[PDB]
Design a protein around this ligand. Sequence first.
Ligand SMILES: COC(=O)[C@@H]1C[C@H](C(=O)O)N[C@H]1[C@H](CC(C)C)NC(C)=O
Length: 387
Amino acid sequence: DFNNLTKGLCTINSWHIYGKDNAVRIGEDSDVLVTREPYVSCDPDECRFYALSQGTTIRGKHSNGTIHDRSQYRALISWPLSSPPTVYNSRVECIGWSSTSCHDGKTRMSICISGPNNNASAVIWYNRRPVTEINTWARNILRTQESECVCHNGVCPVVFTDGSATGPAETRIYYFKEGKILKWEPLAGTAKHIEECSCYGERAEITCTCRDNWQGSNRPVIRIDPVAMTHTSQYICSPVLTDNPRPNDPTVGKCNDPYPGNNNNGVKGFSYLDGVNTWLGRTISIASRSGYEMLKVPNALTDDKSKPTQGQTIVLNTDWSGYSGSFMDYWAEGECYRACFYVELIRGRPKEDKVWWTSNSIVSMCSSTEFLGQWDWPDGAKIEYFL
Ligand SMILES: COC(=O)[C@@H]1C[C@H](C(=O)O)N[C@H]1[C@H](CC(C)C)NC(C)=O
């Protein structure tokens, strides 16, 4: 049967290490593919790492220029958890340079988008076969979440965006079932710009924390009702800003508007908004993608004055991070859903231009009801070795 979001989130008192692939360190002397925009996603019988290959190995001569985001040599690949994305173990879900993927309890739906900027197209795969196609509607880089979608009784909402990344754009929430379109709605609510949403599901509701790439340093949020197939949007009210780059934390945040200070830029991120059991993720640095920390900010979503009450560093401010998204093992034993997340640890350009490539490795953590001691998890690769 299709999976149903019948549980609530487990109580988040800290974070335990879930998975790490040390891909760059290993790829230094093995056939590991160059990737970026990775995530984690589970099936009823296993969980896997996901990412957008660049169609070449790190050591390969074609790794030169992989700082680019959209080429005809990219594809959404998945591989064994904590293993590295190698040529020999990576499974291709579909061809394209923007994606999302999730299992509905019976089988898996995967979405890849490809094509020129003014004419991209999305192909929705289900049970590994192509089923539905959707052409651009704004003729400007049709794109998706870059992390797993979430399903409820067969219905799997997916947030897309087409248009300018630096101003008003055309965002849509598609409601799929068995890879077929049941309905779609244009974005509503007060979120003024949407991109790369990180979502999770609990108690028949789907929360997506996204990125306002044009004006908000606070992160927009879309909560979706998968049964009525309706949604609303707002901004995380809390003054604890979580995008990047971003201005310094104020004492009051903004609920229905973007907090200003930085324009046309950002990073994919996520949060878990569950009343007092709310945790936010953010790079430690306000100017670059360095370091990563989790911050317990009770009622962040609705309290425009909520400040940290607990925290945990995931990556030190002297190590590179990157995209970060949410996922959960909706098929684990237990009474509650265990909040998990991954952090893309970017290596190479533009920050490390001694090499001509841009890749990353993965770190993943899930929550614990215990108050576990913390440690930091850097990529671990030594750039000098690639010289
Ligand atoms: C797959 O590439 C990404 O995720 C890239 C990565 C890059 C970043 O922020 O690091 N910007 C994304 C770019 C953002 C758009 C809104 C301009 N998306 C696409 C599909 O080109």
